[PDB]
Amino acid sequence: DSNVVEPTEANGKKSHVGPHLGSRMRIYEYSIEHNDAFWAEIARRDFYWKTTWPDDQHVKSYNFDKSKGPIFVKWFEGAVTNVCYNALDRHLPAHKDRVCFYFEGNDPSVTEAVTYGSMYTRVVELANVLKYQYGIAKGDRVGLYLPMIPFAAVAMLACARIGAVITVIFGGFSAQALSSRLKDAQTKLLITADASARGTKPIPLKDVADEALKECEEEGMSIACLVAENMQSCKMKEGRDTWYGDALARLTPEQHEECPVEWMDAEDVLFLLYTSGSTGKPKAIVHTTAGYMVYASTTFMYSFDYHMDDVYFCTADIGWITGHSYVVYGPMIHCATSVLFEGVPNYPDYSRWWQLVEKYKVSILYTAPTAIRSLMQAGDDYVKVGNRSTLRVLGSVGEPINVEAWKWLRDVGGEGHCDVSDTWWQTETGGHMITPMPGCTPMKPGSATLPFFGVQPVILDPMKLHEKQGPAEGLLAIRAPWPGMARTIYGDHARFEKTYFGVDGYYMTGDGARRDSDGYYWITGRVDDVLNVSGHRIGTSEIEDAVNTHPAVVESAVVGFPHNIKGEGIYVFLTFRQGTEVTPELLAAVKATVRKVIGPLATPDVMQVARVGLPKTRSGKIVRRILRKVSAGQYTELGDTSTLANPDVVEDLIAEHQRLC
């Protein structure tokens, strides 16, 4: 095809796989036909095991078919390992002087090169604080509410080292959203920081944590709080709250040097990550130890073709799966040199990421289509002042990338001497599932291209629910297990089977897709009422619930709409009680309610008042198709109105939307 972009010659010569698609397809075919041997050989080559699994030929067991029994997946069962030891200890002493993180703060005068040796010291100190001052035991839950600073990685690895289970709460979440997660995960300890800064905006962290802990205490939980000094005179509750500096001082000197490793079974839980579904409140996706460890690290190495002479920079936050797999765990297990950045691409100005690229000789950069589009809007002058000669791989994650942004990323940001890895995956898959690999994969802008090693995607007919062969469009599903797959939903396996295994034999992704005549996949987006807003998965029912907590609100309906920067924006239709004085202030207060309940990531982009009411059937069900079409200006595609109790409303909905948009 004419839209194919060939991999660069230089990347082809460097590739772990090889210089042409045949090289990839050789390994892929083996990884499907000899799936157990493939993963056993990868596992043996790339990771330390205290104890190996008993049989290379059977490293997985599973059931994808509800009629046979409960759904389950296990990998490397019988093996013993530790994630911290693989990310940190095994790299010493040879690499003690290698940089692990080139850290930069929001303020560009705040910088630190943190070596693997220094990370070991930091992690050993914290692990001992958790063990001997908090009595954190194997399997206990620990919450993290942290900015993108070295201590965030340190805390994730320390918890891994002692077998604690982390649940990371994105620093953008509100106090109520943090509290809900702490309660549901039953965390014994919260680790946070005094505060951070994003651009000119203060990011309170401990002050937010204070309200959240107060909420948890009103519900009878007892949660201790350990606070890192990032910027302060934060309110510290006596007996509950400790400064990390005061904890460090209570360590004996040899506890700055040694902390024993908890040796973990393969299916021991590593972390819980709360994720939005189509219904109900967000639920925690459960990842265990060995299979996730293997999958996240192996995708890191191949999807980005990471070598030891590469310098890697992922712009994603630890509050999301991308920062778990591709900021902390994956990169450090392969002993990568990474850039860790606390701030934003536009502070001090829009050259900031390019200043980081040139300063640290970044060769692999992993970011999001929404960020690329904002840089595009900002103007190319902010890119072209920077030396980009070291870049050779650029990655895109979290939402579909339009052809214009792809081309701009590669030919402006990467100066035309870069391969682009558009990686499709989700929280539930642990790691990349469909992705280009640099040097060996011809690229089609906008396509994730081919399945990762060991992955068998399919297109299911939305009607017949069987596999469709050849070029086809339908539901994207995976027909076989891979080591990184989530093992359950915390406390709700029933919902897990319902959500992902409604079609016996398959993992249902929740995404739509088209596979073309070359076998390349094109992901079309969620097929359920889940939005991807600036790359962030968020459920429409959660936003409606938050909107409806305002006392003036009678009812709301939330839909996504196309957005030229964010990919998808948040559109709110709502009705107020009779007599309400509707002003921009009131609308702003309803937005603030959403931001208090959830956080700024859920901020409504458009608020439309249904002066006559929402379109509902005679049974009271809101007809969401009308609202989706109206919010997108697709006035001609509204569809059926014959089941509306109130067909009079349709004219107003269009009229008002035209007024606004």
Ligand X SMILES: CC(C)(COP(=O)(O)OP(=O)(O)OC[C@H]1O[C@@H](n2cnc3c(N)ncnc32)[C@H](O)[C@@H]1OP(=O)(O)O)[C@@H](O)C(=O)NCCC(=O)NCCS
By the rule CB under 5 A, 260 interacts with Cl ion = yes
Cβ-contact 356, 314 below 8 angstroms: no
| Alpha carbon distance 290, 264 (integer Å) | 9
Exposure of 474 by Cβ count < 10 A (0-12 exposed, 13-18 middle, 19+ buried)? buried
| Interacting residues with K ion (CB under 5 A) | 398, 532, 535, 537
CB of 172 to ligand X, least distance (A): 4
Exposure of 255 by Cβ count < 10 A (0-12 exposed, 13-18 middle, 19+ buried)? middle
Query: Is 98 marked as a binding-site residue?
Result: no
Q: Which is nearer to Cl ion, 23 or 532 (CB)?
A: 23
Q: What angle do CA 601, 606, 609 make, to 5 degrees?
A: 130
Q: Quote the strand ranges of 479-535, DSSP E.
A: 488-489, 507-515, 521-526, 530-533
**What's the chain's Rg over C-alpha atoms?**
25
Sheet arrangement for strand 606-609: 553-563, 567-576, 606-609
Query: Is 426 marked as a binding-site residue?
Result: yes
Q: Which is nearer to Cl ion, 260 or 639 (CB)?
A: 260
CB of 412 to ligand X, least distance (A): 19
Q: Which is nearer to ligand X, 205 or 440 (CB)?
A: 205
Question: What, of Cl ion, ligand X, K ion, none, does residue 197 touch, CB below 5 to 8 Å by kind?
Answer: none
β-pair type (567-576, 553-563): antiparallel
**Which string of x and - marks every residue 615-654 that binds Cl ion (by CB under 5 A)?**
----------------------------------------
Q: Is 636 left (phi over 0), alpha (psi -120 to 50) or beta?
A: alpha
Q: Which is nearer to ligand X, 429 or 534 (CB)?
A: 534
Query: Is 161 marked as a binding-site residue?
Result: no
* Residues in 306-335 that interact with ligand X by CB under 6 A: 317
* Residues in 594-623 that interact with ligand X by CB under 6 A: 600-601, 603
Q: Is 139 left (phi over 0), alpha (psi -120 to 50) or beta?
A: left
**Which string of x and - marks every residue 262-301 that binds Cl ion (by CB under 5 A)?**
----------------------------------------
Q: Which is nearer to ligand X, 43 or 601 (CB)?
A: 601
Question: What, of ligand X, K ion, Cl ion, none, does residue 534 touch, CB below 5 to 8 Å by kind?
Answer: ligand X
By the rule CB under 6 A, 534 interacts with ligand X = yes
Count how many residues are written for the chain: 661
CA distances from 225 to 81, 171, 180, 210, 432 (A): 29, 16, 16, 9, 34
Task: State which H helix or E strand residue 493 sits in.
Answer: helix 493-500
Among 183, 307, 361, 498, binds Cl ion (CB under 5 A): 307
Exposure of 115 by Cβ count < 10 A (0-12 exposed, 13-18 middle, 19+ buried)? middle
By the rule CB under 5 A, 261 interacts with Cl ion = yes
Closest alpha carbon to 371 in 389, 388, 391, 396: 396
| Interacting residues with ligand AMP (CB under 6 A) | 275, 320-321, 397-400, 422-424, 426-427, 448, 510-511, 523, 525-526, 532, 537
- Choices 221-229, 256-264, 408-416, 624-632 (CB under 5 A): range interacting with Cl ion: 256-264
Query: Is 398 marked as a binding-site residue?
Result: yes
| Alpha carbon distance 211, 207 (integer Å) | 7
Question: What, of ligand AMP, Cl ion, K ion, none, does residue 500 touch, CB below 5 to 8 Å by kind?
Answer: none
Query: Is 239 marked as a binding-site residue?
Result: no
* Residues in 71-130 that interact with ligand X by CB under 6 A: none
In 10 A of CB 98, how many CB atoms?
15
Q: Which residues of this chain interact with ligand X, rule CB under 6 A? A: 171-172, 198, 201, 203, 317, 344, 534, 600-601, 603
Enumerate the known binding-site residues for CoA.
198, 201, 317, 595
Enumerate the known binding-site residues.
198, 201, 317, 398, 422-423, 426-427, 511, 526, 532, 537, 595
